[PDB]
């Protein structure tokens, strides 16, 4: 949000951890909301 990339498909970030244990953490950020407006168009049948 600092640099205005709020509405993004992906957001990768990587930061190093200070202190005595040295390490850096890799992270990718996302928030999917896959939808479909008209569900009635599809007909799902469970066969047997």
């Amino acid at each position: 949000q600092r640099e205005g990339i709020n509405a993004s498909a992906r957001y990768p970030k990587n930061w190093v951890t200070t202190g005595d244990p040295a390490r850096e953490f890799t992270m990718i950020q996302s928030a999917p909301l896959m939808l479909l407006a008209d569900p009635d168009e599809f007909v799902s049948v469970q066969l047997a």
Binding site: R2, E3, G4, I5, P12, K13, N14
Partner: protein, 473 residues
């Protein structure tokens, strides 16, 4: 067989990986430029090197000569010359503008632009210039140039490098870059860091952005500064000079040693004069010889110290020669050292240095100048300040290279003594081997305005009625 294992092992471990220069450079690309900037900012030798580089590649002046391919374009020679002189007049009245309006920052001229660009390409490997169209109506031209340091261009948000998005450079599959992700100014270090993507080329055929560097092999995307082979020795030599200066300081500081069982105050009083009768122990009045009378059991040992420069001059000679080889510059001009060298040797040194500088000039400054000149020329043409020839077989977009054909002249080779070179040029002209524009260029002038000025001078001399000069009839 030498490259296999070496004599008796030796290099039994030296097996560096085989990979592309981009692969070997990009991970530490930032670190190299950081160290190069550190050296160039806080090292005398580096500052001297960059100043010499700019002053010899460009110097004080850097002028244009517009030579369009009239033969290829099917244009009359006289019309081509008329167009060339008109565009030269417009370019000269535009470039030397005092307001530095060619730069959006409005603080540097065209020669300063070229020199700064070549210098930052030298200590970074590459140069970046962008062209912008402002809405200001105060000037006939709306195109201005803006410099970008390689630090400003990098992977946005330090994102992981990919096949095509390398260090903020978006490249097509073939291997030609097309987009850049530049970053705004880093100062002060509390505002959010922003990125802006710019295409290298505008869809209309105008170079919106230009990035100039010389690659070393295929697949290269960023240049390598000239310090990549020298920087470690440079900093080590700096540390050596620092510690040697410290050692000389302390050796000179400590000169005498007093030994006595007596209390120190009384010992100083009875030996080194002192003024205890009237922290820092006691100040000593610097006066006459003051021969003391130390009692048995006392010592006045004067430390002979040691020679300050035990081979350091020769060491600086050798290391500076190595640095000169690494930098491609002559050791003489590098270190301001010109001792025990003859006229022929000095001339040879200046010759090789000048050859290297001319090559570098052509391959960096000439290319950048041509690019920015055609970028200005397209705006001038679309602004109709100059009228194209009617007989133009090809459009400006088609013959952009043909229309914009030009060369450049920088500071000439001010040789060792002047007289011999000028007389040899004169006899070359007599023999008909060289030509007037060639030698006046090598001197830094252009035969056209030279002839115009000589015509003016002889007209003035005729008007004043004193003497016709060495051009008449």
């Amino acid at each position: 067989h030498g490259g296999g294992s070496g004599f008796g092992g030796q290099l039994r471990s030296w097996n560096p990986p085989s990979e592309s220069v981009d692969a070997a450079l990009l991970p530490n690309f930032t670190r190299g430029n950081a160290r190069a900037d550190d050296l160039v900012r806080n090292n005398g030798y580096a500052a001297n090197a960059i100043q010499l580089h700019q002053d010899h590649i460009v110097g004080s002046f850097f002028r244009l000569s517009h030579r369009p391919s009239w033969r290829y374009l099917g244009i009359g020679e006289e019309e081509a010359r008329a167009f060339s002189r008109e565009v030269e007049a417009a370019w000269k009245e535009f470039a030397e503008d005092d307001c530095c309006c060619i730069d959006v920052e409005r603080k540097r001229t065209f020669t300063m632009m070229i020199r700064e660009g070549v210098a930052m390409h030298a200590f970074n490997g590459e140069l970046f210039v962008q062209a912008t169209w402002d809405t200001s109506s105060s000037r006939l031209f709306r195109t201005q140039f803006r410099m970008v340091s390689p630090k400003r261009i990098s992977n946005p948000n330090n994102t992981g490098d990919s096949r095509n998005c390398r260090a903020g450079v978006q490249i097509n599959d073939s291997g030609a870059a097309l987009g850049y992700y530049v970053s705004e100014d880093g100062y002060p270090g509390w505002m959010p860091q922003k990125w802006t993507w710019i295409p290298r080329e505008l869809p209309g055929g105008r170079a919106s952005f230009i990035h100039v560097f010389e690659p070393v092999e295929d697949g290269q995307t960023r240049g390598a500064n000239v310090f990549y082979s020298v920087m470690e020795q440079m900093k080590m030599l700096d540390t050596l000079q620092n510690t040697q200066l410290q050692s000389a300081i302390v050796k000179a500081m400590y000169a005498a040693t007093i030994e006595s069982e007596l209390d120190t105050q009384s010992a100083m009083d009875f030996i080194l004069g002192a003024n205890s009768q009237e922290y820092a122990a006691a100040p000593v009045r610097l006066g006459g010889a003051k021969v003391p009378h130390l009692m048995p059991g006392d010592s006045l040992n004067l430390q002979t110290a040691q020679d300050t420069d035990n081979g350091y001059s020769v060491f600086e000679q050798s290391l500076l020669r190595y640095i000169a080889a690494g930098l491609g510059v002559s050791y003489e001009q590098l270190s301001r050292n010109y001792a025990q060298m003859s006229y022929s040797t000095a001339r040879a040194s200046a010759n090789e240095s000048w050859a290297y500088f001319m090559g570098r000039r052509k391959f960096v400054a000439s290319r950048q100048a041509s690019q920015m000149f055609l970028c200005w020329l397209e705006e001038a043409i679309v602004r109709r300040v100059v009228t194209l020839p009617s007989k133009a077989r090809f459009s400006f977009q088609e013959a952009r290279s043909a229309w914009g054909n030009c060369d450049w002249i920088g500071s000439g080779r001010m040789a060792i003594d002047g007289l011999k070179e000028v007389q040899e040029a004169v006899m070359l002209i007599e023999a008909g081997l060289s030509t007037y524009e060639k030698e006046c260029a090598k001197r830094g002038d252009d035969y056209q305005e030279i002839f115009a000025q000589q015509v003016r001078e002889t007209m003035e001399r005729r008007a004043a009625g004193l003497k016709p000069p060495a051009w008449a009839a």
